Design a protein around this ligand. Structure first.
Ligand code: CN6
Ligand code: CN6
Ligand code: 8PE
Ligand code: 8PE
Ligand code: HEM
Ligand code: HEM
Ligand code: HEM
Ligand code: HEM
Ligand code: HEM
Ligand code: 6PH
Ligand code: 9PE
Ligand code: 9PE
Ligand code: SMA
Ligand code: SMA
Ligand SMILES: OC[C@H]1O[C@@](CO)(O[C@H]2O[C@H](CO)[C@@H](O)[C@H](O)[C@H]2O)[C@@H](O)[C@@H]1O
Lengths: 385, 125, 93, 246, 55, 385, 93
């Protein structure tokens, strides 16, 4: 037997990266996974190196990031890579998830795979949030305040949890310092979940754009997909380099270049772009508690897809109605994000409420109705009886 | 260390009256102090088996002795786990502490040695 | 190791697919093929055909959403101009 | 290493807080503070100790509030931006005698009196060493030992030559509770107070230790009994060999 | 032991009861320890000294 | 089959902790591994929670540990658990390694298991070093100073490596801040290494006190060993509790209660007890370069044991001469530690040099000579001619 | 699942040992055994068994090292006392 298959350690590398039987027809959309792995490594490495020059003290945080920006050799590259890297991490993750909805990657026998993914998504969002808090700009402070306060909605113990998360009367020293400690911790938890993710992927293998069995024609991971993934890796690095060196602050907010001030919430306050859709959902509900529940349900409803998809075939490739409504969903998500960046004003408030409804209706009403209808369309459109 | 090597040195001493009168007593003492007989094991039962030579030897060992070896091993682990020794009447006696596997081991070792030499022979044209 | 829970995928030699018979495949070494410099003139026009079978599934919803946004954004601009303060006061509170 | 260089070993005194079940003597802590304030404070700081920690340990809320209000601290500047002072509060730390290291060394012939907040844990010997040092200054160094101009002989100090002179003398303080303020009594009292400064969690630490050790001791014996039960079938398992027929 | 049988009858104690017992044990055990501890240290505690200092 | 065997995640738990076939006769010495797992978890959990109130800046480091001791609820418990925990971690690792030496655990087919273990030992020592530096006491400063300087012995690039490690002209702010960053990192690498350790352990299973095959009588891990391990878990906790609440500082050095001072190295400087033997080894060589080499070789020589043991049987149970020298070695190791705690003075210097030679001679001379002699003794003590 | 290497240990049903025949084993339920009293009957009685059999292999090296330590420790004590400064000047520099 070849040493790569016989050795205890290399055999794992071989089964996941070398001899892994991949469906011959997977397209570039199946390259997002490896790209997400790259993102995690970029975040961890750039983060550890910056951590070496960081001070979590609330009185020293902002200045310590400025110290990295000015005094640390190549320090601006670390920060711009880390910061822009976060956004790219989310853009690639959204595409990874979208790819899933589209090709029915969430359905049997891959539900465990999908559920772990939803878990990872939540963890990543919390991580990115904790990270943003460590800069301690104006957006950092208020983001920390709003988000920790999200828990004050829990009845009875509500305000107690917030006080506990803060470690005091308001977002202050104890909060920033613990948030840095947790920011360092979660990425390793995510790495562990990614292993669980890959474990669940492995026993069933990847699906393909045709939505049918790939067992009749598999090709090895090595060379074919190792080199195909390299294509997207370089593209990913090219686009990211463009932002890091030429437009480092386009995806950010100017207000975060201002030290946190406990007495002033800027009128120009806006959440990080990747959280806008969820933020818009929360604002659409004129009730505190219902607002936070709906926003959290917006993430959890992703778990319902395996059951509401009544279709007898996996994927949207051969489904006119599903393909159409899928894009309604994508652009509705984008719109929810746009509403998020707007002020709570007349036309926008209604648009957000209707878009929020469409967001939930997609998983709970549209998918099951459309899939059922298509099941019957495929049948009567050929069966002659 | 190979058993061929052990045997070569051991035979040499065992054939020499001078060395034999000097060493063997010390060796007898060593084996009694070793205490494996009190556990009901024969020395050959102690040889680490996780290597090709021993697997070959254990394969070739006749059925009946193989079942006997298995018993001594199982009985020993049990005795050892209870932190006791076997009653004296169950201890392996010196007469019984025979090198039953040794001949199979030496045979396997000689075959591998030849195979190694033949795999690396040089030719003189 | 312990007994493994069976899935719908196997490994080389026992992939889990149906028995294959009667199918023959042929392939030529990449080393003996035209140095991939024949992407244009031979099949450059073959493109567009791919994104002509799909553009409507993306474009119509994108169009539906673009106009909904453009329509609401203009209304907002009017509501907040001197001219719109009349309607703004009514629709607001 | 020579005896002089090593320094004399400090004997073991019977501190009422020595022992797994003993708390500090709070009356001794309270008396110790007085000795610190009246005798040591002039040269030694207690920077890691906040007034509020004395409350409920050696003084009442009122007593500490009044003690703190005798000192000034930098307040927030006025509306014009000019600096202003304010009386200390429970949240403040016991103020030191010197503004900086330079001022301290100047008032002590180049020597720097260390902060005593951790002195008990920062020296081999603990309380025994502190007590022995404070009460171990002879009237004169041993014969043959030449003492550096400005130094004082103390056998317990490594080298024997220490910059601090003996400061504890009979009845230089008048204890509030009428206790005879002898040198050794004062030494015993401040050392006790200094141990509290270094280990304010002492009393509470030992109380939880009693709880923790009784639970774990029980847990340990329990686990053994349980283990023996789950292994009883294996421990008494019997084997018999009957050579199979060929 | 019949003392055990009268309460659980050949069954092992269930989680709910175990947890419930743990809650009762914490309260009772703490009180007993603090009580023993404070008494062993009578005269040394601040509350004891505060009573003394009355002038 | 049972869900614990068919589920992708549970089957891992089942194979390693439930149905895992253990030799029926493994004694309490085999409980040290589970104990090291507990230590790692204890160290990580307590470290993270303390991390929430710690400041790496060289000016706030020492006081922030004092802040954890005084102001943090149960903070002194966290610190004493962490600090004393580190000590117990080494005492248990020393016993685990000694168990390995005595029973020939390093012998084939467990060589990789042993090698990964040597890797873990090195990472663990480096982690402990980095953690001690974070306190920033007198011992911390000078320990950081001495140890980083170990690399100055590398010819040519030596001094650059040290300036690079320090990030300046001497152990200072950038040194403590990166050391804390690194202290946080390595425990996660060790965990990764522990998983590899267990993977190697799993393909061959554990050995046993008899040194012969355990294949004829295995009993499941669950119940028998899950409960046997619990016994040692509680005794470990009981003893750690005795130190944590009743004698929390006897294993440390009082000098680390004095803030680091760049201008004064205390005459009472002494390394942490678990590092004393290696310290003694280095101190025995009157040459800078040769001194660091020998000290590092003292760890690496553990790698040669699989090849220097000529015995035809695994383990020392039935070997009088090997048993005697095994204890010579153990006691020589303790003496090396006691020598380390003494001053560089006449009787002690020669003793250390002699003990250092005994340490290396055990692996390179005594073991191969004694094992060869015992092979022959077992032979001539029974065979007739 | 991929083919991994062979080892000297398998799993339940194919552990890797020789074929077993002729051995009969017996056991009794822990529930039917005397409520554990072997902690102070055959544990304290059989106590010091593991002691008197092995102690010499530990005690002799322990004693050798302890003596060497005490001897060198006392020599140091003398070397640094008044009576030893003469021999100290010699053996040192
Ligand atoms: C956004 C900020 C962060 C993200 C940065 C990273 C971006 C990567 C994500 C993009 C992605 O996944 O796109 C996938 C689609 C699907 O494509 P497909 O149906 O599987 O491909 C058939 C190939 O042409 C076969 O052709 P090929 O022989 O493999 O060469 C393909 C093509 C690949 O180009 C790429 O870089 C891949 C996107 O190279 C070229 O000839 C053109 C070079 C510009 O690729 C597309 O063409 C997009 C269509 C909308
Ligand atoms: C400073 C930091 C220290 C941290 C480490 C703390 C953990 C220490 C681990 C101790 C250890 O590994 O010692 C193992 C040896 C080997 O022992 P053996 O051959 O496998 O046992 C036969 C049993 O009696 C079987 O007997 P058993 O039925 O399983 O009960 C055994 C005994 C176990 O006690 C323990 O906790 C084990 C140490 O329970 C009792 O009866 C004690 C009642 C008070 O046990 C000994 O001989 C101990 C002397 C070294
Ligand atoms: C919490 C909720 C998570 C979900 C959030 C989702 C957010 C949206 C994600 C952003 C990007 C959207 C990615 C689109 C999803 C995958 C698209 C896809 O797979 O398209 C496949 C389709 C044709 O593919 P076929 O496999 O069916 O072809 C068969 C040939 N016989 O090929 C096509 O349709 C053409 C490609 C379409 C490009 C996508 C355009 C939309 C771009 C959004 C712009 C972002 C604004 C900032
Ligand atoms: C870098 C390299 C590091 C390695 C250095 C070594 C680590 C330092 C040593 C620390 C303690 C380790 C002690 C030795 C390890 C355990 C030894 C062992 O496994 O002993 C087994 C033995 C008896 O067991 P048997 O199975 O052989 O009995 C025969 C039954 N038929 O059991 C016995 O013989 C009794 C055990 C006696 C232990 C006494 C140990 C003395 C240690 C000094 C303590 C240090 C504190 C200052
Ligand atoms: C850091 C996060 C993640 C990493 C590193 C990761 C990585 C991967 C990898 C390597 C693959 C195989 C190749 C591919 O399909 O791209 C994969 C497949 C998959 N992942 Fe993820 N993933 C992550 C997050 C998620 C999330 C958030 C979801 C869903 C909510 C998800 C859902 C899926 C699904 C369903 C598949 C199977 C797709 C198919 O074969 O059709 N993953 N992932
Ligand atoms: C793997 C997922 C990670 C993500 C998604 C992530 C994301 C972020 C985000 C959003 C910020 C704010 C960027 C800005 O606007 O300045 C940030 C900051 C920071 N992160 Fe992370 N991070 C990750 C991992 C890590 C790790 C492992 C560390 C290690 C300690 C780390 C250390 C830091 C530091 C020190 C900062 C502050 C300096 C800065 O602004 O870049 N991060 N992180
Ligand atoms: C009873 C009140 C006092 C206490 C409890 C006290 C305690 C101490 C202690 C424990 C040390 C540490 C010695 C060591 O390094 O081991 C010390 C040093 C010192 N003390 Fe005090 N002290 C007191 C009063 C004073 C006074 C009034 C002064 C100032 C005139 C003074 C000046 C010094 C100096 C200069 C040192 C430096 C010793 C050296 O390094 O040689 N002390 N004291
Ligand atoms: C974080 C530290 C470590 C962990 C968690 C760990 C854990 C374990 C575990 C759970 C076992 C099986 C049960 C046992 O024998 O105790 C084991 C076995 C073993 N480990 Fe480690 N170990 C560690 C470090 C080391 C080191 C430093 C070495 C060697 C230099 C080592 C050598 C071995 C060997 C040789 C075995 C097999 C013992 C036998 O079956 O005879 N381990 N370890
Ligand atoms: C294998 C695990 C670990 C080991 C062996 C270890 C060891 C150490 C040691 C020896 C010290 C100095 C102890 C003292 O004398 O005070 C220390 C301090 C410290 N460690 Fe760790 N550590 C570990 C893991 C962690 C982790 C994961 C973190 C970070 C989340 C952490 C954070 C700290 C902090 C905050 C200090 C300073 C407070 C203190 O002095 O205890 N440690 N560590
Ligand atoms: C990293 C490693 C750290 C720890 C390693 C130690 C391994 C032992 C874990 C103990 C789990 C016991 C579960 C037993 C079980 O499920 O069997 C259940 C029975 O469980 C019980 O009776 C509960 C007894 C109380 C368990 C004590 C908790 C241990 C304290 C935790 C300390 C560990 C840090 C099956 O019982 P049955 O077989 O009779 O039907
Ligand atoms: C969170 C962790 C997730 C899972 C971890 C597993 C992932 C494995 C990724 C690691 C890839 C690197 C493998 C290199 C090892 C290959 C060589 C080897 O195993 O040789 C080993 C010896 O290895 C060693 O001594 C050191 C181990 C290396 C430690 C690396 C940090 C020989 O072992 P061998 O397979 O040949 O055994 C049969 C021969 N009688
Ligand atoms: C550092 C980590 C190293 C990586 C090793 C991973 C080992 C994991 C050890 C812990 C196992 C404990 C959790 C396993 C959960 C078992 C239940 C399960 O798998 O149910 C799953 C569904 O699980 C989910 O939806 C969410 C799983 C989230 C796990 C969060 C930790 C049922 O999966 P099922 O096996 O029945 O699939 C049948 C084929 N259609
Ligand atoms: C110790 C760790 C803790 C406490 C972690 C808590 C994690 C909570 C959630 O993660 C799972 C949460 C981050 C996630 O909710 C699902 C996001 C979508 C929340 C989106 C979000 O962002 C905002 C933001 O970023 C801002 O910045 C300036 C300002 C904001 O209002 C003005 C918001 C805001 O109103 C909302 C809803
Ligand atoms: C960024 C990461 C870095 C630089 C990691 C470096 C790792 C180095 C080694 O670990 C692999 C190292 C810790 C290990 O050597 C093998 C130890 C046995 C070192 C033993 C050691 O301790 C001392 C110590 O603790 C002191 O305290 C006050 C003082 C010391 O002299 C006065 C020493 C000392 O003279 C030695 C040799
Ligand atoms: O600072 C005290 C001062 O006293 C001198 C006077 O010669 O030393 C003698 O008196 C000291 C105080 O009683 C003793 O501590 C000292 O041991 C004794 O020789 C000066 O040397 C010293 O500076």
């Amino acid at each position: 037997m070849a040493f790569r298959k016989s050795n205890v350690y290399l055999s794992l590398v071989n089964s996941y990266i070398i001899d892994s039987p991949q469906p011959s027809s997977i397209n570039y959309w199946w390259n997002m996974g490896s790209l997400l792995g790259l993102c995690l490594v970029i975040q961890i490495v750039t983060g550890i190196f910056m951590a070496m020059h960081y001070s979590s003290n609330i009185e020293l945080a902002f200045s310590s990031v400025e110290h990295i920006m000015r005094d640390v050799h190549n320090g601006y590259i670390l920060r711009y890579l880390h910061a822009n890297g976060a956004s790219f991490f989310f853009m690639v993750m959204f595409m990874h998830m979208a790819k899933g909805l589209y090709y029915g990657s969430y359905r049997s026998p891959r539900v465990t795979l999908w559920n772990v993914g939803v878990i990872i998504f939540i963890l990543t969002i919390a991580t990115a949030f904790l990270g943003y808090c460590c800069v301690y700009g104006q957006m950092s402070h208020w983001g920390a305040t709003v988000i920790t306060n999200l828990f004050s909605a829990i009845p009875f113990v509500g305000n107690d949890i917030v006080s506990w998360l803060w470690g005091g009367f308001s977002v202050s020293n104890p909060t920033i310092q613990r948030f840095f400690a947790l920011h360092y911790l979660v990425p390793f938890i995510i790495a562990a979940m990614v292993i669980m993710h890959l474990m669940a992927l492995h026993i069933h293998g990847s699906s393909n754009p045709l939505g049918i069995t790939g067992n009749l024609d598999r090709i090895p991971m090595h060379s074919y997909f190792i080199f195909k993934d390299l294509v997207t890796v370089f593209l990913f690095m090219l686009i990211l380099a463009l932002f890091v060196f030429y437009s480092p602050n386009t995806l950010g907010h100017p207000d975060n270049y201002i030290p946190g001030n406990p007495l002033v919430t800027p009128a120009s306050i806006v959440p990080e772009w990747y959280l806008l859709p969820f933020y818009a959902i929360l604002r659409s509900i004129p009730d505190k508690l219902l607002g936070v529940i709906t926003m959290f349900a917006a993430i959890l409803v992703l778990l319902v897809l395996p059951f509401t998809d009544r279709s007898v075939v996996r994927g949207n490739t051969f489904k006119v109605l599903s393909k159409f409504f899928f894009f309604i969903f994508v652009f509705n998500f984008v719109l929810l994000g746009q509403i998020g960046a707007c002020h709570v004003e007349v036309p926008y408030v209604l648009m957000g409420q209707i878009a929020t409804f469409i967001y939930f209706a997609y998983f709970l009403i549209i998918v099951p109705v459309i899939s059922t209808i298509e099941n019957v369309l495929f049948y009567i459109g050929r069966v002659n009886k | 260390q190979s058993f061929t090597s052990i045997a070569r040195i051991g035979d040499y001493i065992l054939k020499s009256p001078v060395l034999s009168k000097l060493c063997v007593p010390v060796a007898n003492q060593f084996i009694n102090l070793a205490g494996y007989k009190k556990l009901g094991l024969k020395f050959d039962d102690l040889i680490a088996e996780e290597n090709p030579i021993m697997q070959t030897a254990l394969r070739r060992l006749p059925e009946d002795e193989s079942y006997a070896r298995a018993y001594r091993i199982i009985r020993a682990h049990q005795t050892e786990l209870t932190h006791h020794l076997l009653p004296r009447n169950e201890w392996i006696k010196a007469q019984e502490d025979v090198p039953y596997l040794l001949p199979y081991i030496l045979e396997a070792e000689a075959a591998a040695k030849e195979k190694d030499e033949l795999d690396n022979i040089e030719v003189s044209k | 190791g312990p007994p493994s829970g069976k899935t719908y995928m196997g490994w080389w030699g026992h992939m889990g697919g149906p028995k294959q018979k009667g199918i023959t495949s042929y392939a030529v070494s990449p080393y003996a093929q035209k140095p991939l410099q024949g992407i244009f003139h031979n099949a450059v026009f073959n493109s567009f055909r791919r994104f002509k079978s799909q553009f409507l599934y993306v474009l119509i919803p994108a169009g539906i959403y673009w106009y909904w946004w453009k329509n609401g954004n203009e209304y907002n601009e009017f509501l907040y101009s001197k001219a719109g303060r009349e309607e703004l006061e009514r629709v607001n509170v | 290493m020579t005896a002089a260089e090593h320094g004399l070993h400090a004997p073991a005194y019977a501190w009422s807080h020595n022992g797994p079940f003993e708390t500090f003597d709070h009356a001794s802590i309270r008396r110790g503070y007085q000795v610190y304030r009246e005798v040591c404070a002039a040269c030694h700081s207690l920077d890691r100790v906040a007034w509020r920690t004395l409350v409920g340990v050696s003084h009442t809320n009122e007593e500490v509030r009044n003690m703190a209000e005798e000192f000034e601290y930098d307040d927030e500047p006025d509306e014009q931006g000019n600096p202003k002072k304010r009386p200390g509060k429970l949240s403040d730390y016991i103020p030191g005698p010197y503004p900086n290291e330079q001022a301290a060394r100047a008032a002590n012939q180049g020597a720097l009196p260390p902060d005593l907040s951790l002195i008990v844990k920062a020296r081999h010997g603990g309380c025994d060493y502190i007590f022995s040092l404070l009460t171990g200054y002879p009237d004169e160094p041993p014969a043959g030992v030449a003492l550096p101009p400005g130094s004082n002989y103390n056998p317990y100090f490594p080298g024997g030559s220490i910059a601090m002179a003996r400061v504890l003398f009979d009845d230089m303080v008048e204890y509030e509770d009428g206790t005879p303020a002898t040198t050794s009594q004062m030494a015993k009292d401040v050392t006790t107070f200094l141990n509290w400064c270094a280990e304010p969690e002492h009393d509470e630490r030992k109380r939880l230790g009693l709880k923790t050790v009784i639970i774990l001791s029980s847990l340990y014996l329990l686990s053994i009994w349980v283990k023996k039960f789950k292994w009883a079938g294996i421990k008494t398992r019997k084997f018999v060999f009957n050579p199979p027929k060929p | 032991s019949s003392l055990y049988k009268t309460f659980f009858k050949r069954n092992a104690v269930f989680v709910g009861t175990i947890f419930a017992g743990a809650f009762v044990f914490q309260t009772v055990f703490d009180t007993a320890i603090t009580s023993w501890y404070e008494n062993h240290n009578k005269g040394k505690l601040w509350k004891d000294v505060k009573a003394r200092i009355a002038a």
